[PDB]
Structures are given as C-alpha cells and as structure tokens.
A = this chain, B = another copy of it.
C-alpha cells in the first residue's frame, strides 16, 4: 500500500529529507548526472532500459542524458514539496509510477537507485542516516509499482 508507505514518513524522516535536499538539490544538473552515471556503473544491467538516451558513457556531454537527469531531480523536488500533504504526495508518486510501469520497471529494479543516492549523499558528507531516510521515500514509489 502506497498509503501505508507514505505514513512511514515521520517527523524525523521528513526533517532529514529536507535538510539533505537543501544540499543535493542545490546542483540539480551535477548531482542528477552523478546519480544516473553511478546507476549505470554499479548496475550495468539497467543500461538497456535507457536506449533513447544514446551513449550514456559520455555523461554530462550527452544532451539527452543531461536533460533527463535535470528533470529527474525536479521529480525529487516535487516529492519533497509534497511532504506536508500525504494525499498530494501520493498522487504525484502514482504519476511517476505509471511512467515506469510503462517501461516495465519493477519495484525491485526501481530500488537499485538506493545505491547511487547513498553514494551521492556520502560524497557530500551525508551518511547512512540520510541514506535510510531517502530509502523510505523511494519505498513510497516502490509501493505503487
């Protein structure tokens, strides 16, 4: 249930998400591409899903990858801005869920993003505490897949 998952976002979790987002969200282009490139390096078996982006090994130099990456960060910004209202968070999460259900992405594969996020957070000095907080948010999307 996406509703039960959304309920797991307690006061403490929401604070950690906001505090860390102030930092990671300050450079959407750079951190977005870093998240994506890490995903492709750590789980090479997912590259096949992104054929539309072309050669993702080019990183920041790939225009399609950069556009996709920046937009991905705005999806996260969207989630963070809906933390105050469970009903609105749910409706936006289900919106992006569809975008992935159409690409045949399961909850298990969607979860492969936790690794990259934890690595990007660690590079900015945010440890496991924040990684776990973000994992709970990703869990809300997984519940809708």
Cβ-defined partner of A66 (8 Å) among B67, B81, B91: B91
- A–B Cβ pairs within 8 angstroms, 9 of them: A52-B98, A63-B90, A67-B92, A70-B92, A71-B92, A71-B95, A71-B96, A74-B74, A74-B75
What range describes how many residues of A lie at the interface? 20 to 34
* A28, A64, A94, A95, most chain B CB atoms within 10 A: A95
B residues near A96, Cβ cutoff 8 Å = 71
- Are A63 and B77 neighbours in the complex by a CB distance under 8 Å? no
- Are A91 and B70 neighbours in the complex by a CB distance under 8 Å? yes
A42 CB–B CB distance under 8 Å:
no
- Are A94 and B78 neighbours in the complex by a CB distance under 8 Å? no
Cβ-defined partner of A91 (8 Å) among B52, B64, B90: B64
Interface residues of A in 56-98 (CB under 8 A from B): 63-64, 66-68, 70-71, 74-75, 77-78, 81-82, 87-88, 90-92, 94-96, 98
10 closest A-B pairs by beta carbon, nearest first, are: A67-B91, A67-B95, A63-B91, A67-B92, A74-B74, A74-B78, A66-B91, A71-B95, A70-B92, A68-B95
